Amino acid sequence: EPVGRLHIFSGAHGPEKDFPLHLGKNVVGRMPDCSVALPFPSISKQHAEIEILAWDKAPILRDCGSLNGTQILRPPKVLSPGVSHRLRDQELILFADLLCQYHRL
Amino acid sequence: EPVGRLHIFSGAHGPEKDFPLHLGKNVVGRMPDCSVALPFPSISKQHAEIEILAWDKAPILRDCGSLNGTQILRPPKVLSPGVSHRLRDQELILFADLLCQYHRL
Numbered sequence: 001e002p003v004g005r006l007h008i009f010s011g012a013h014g015p016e017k018d019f020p021l022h023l024g025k026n027v028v029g030r031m032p033d034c035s036v037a038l039p040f041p042s043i044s045k046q047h048a049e050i051e052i053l054a055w056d057k058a059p060i061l062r063d064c065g066s067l068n069g070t071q072i073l074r075p076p077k078v079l080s081p082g083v084s085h086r087l088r089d090q091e092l093i094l095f096a097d098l099l100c101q102y103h104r105l
Numbered sequence: 106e107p108v109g110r111l112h113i114f115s116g117a118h119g120p121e122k123d124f125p126l127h128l129g130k131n132v133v134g135r136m137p138d139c140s141v142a143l144p145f146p147s148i149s150k151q152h153a154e155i156e157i158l159a160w161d162k163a164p165i166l167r168d169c170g171s172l173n174g175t176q177i178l179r180p181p182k183v184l185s186p187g188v189s190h191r192l193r194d195q196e197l198i199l200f201a202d203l204l205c206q207y208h209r210l
Contacts (some may be wrong), residue, residue: 073199076176090116090117092116
């Protein structure tokens with residue numbers, strides 16, 4: 001049923017966790033209603049989104065106007081609001097200071 | 106015996122791996138004889154050095170004039186050759202396009 005998963009490494013925020021990613025918009029945010037719920041003060045209510053349109057198309061990551069930002073490593077930079085970034089299998093990203101890794105299932 | 110560990114995250118290059126770090130100069134490079142051997146095209150023969158110091162002092166990370174560079178994250182910082190960067194526990198490091206993480210043991 002899920003197309004991918006997002007792994008959030010253990011850190012200053014607490015223990016490791018994994019989140020399934022589905023077709024459609026997967027919201028990353030502080031609230032429990034988010035697909036990727038990260039209840040930490042540095043994470044915005046609607047922080048970012050990972051949109052998956054098809055099983056065989058790369059997910060697209062966007063920042064939603066978050067306070068503390070989203071960072072990519074291809075190339076290393078802050079991903080500004082509204083700019084699309086296509087994720088590759090095993091790609092690492094940061095939401096505020098939280099390191100995450102995307103896995104295609 | 107090892108007093109540190111360098112973690113290399115998984116990616117398109119292959120699976121995750123850990124490397125022990127010892128007191129003194131731990132060379133990071135493409136060569137098999139390097140303390141931290143990273144057999145990937147983007148990594149220079151002598152890429153960087155992590156100097157582990159005694160007396161609980163912070164290790165020193167230096168770039169050895171590599172082709173593709175070394176960078177630090179949270180916050181992002183480009184590491185020029187000749188700069189001694191003092192590593193913090195759990196520091197994220199980019200060698201070329203390869204993400205790794207330093208752990209004090």
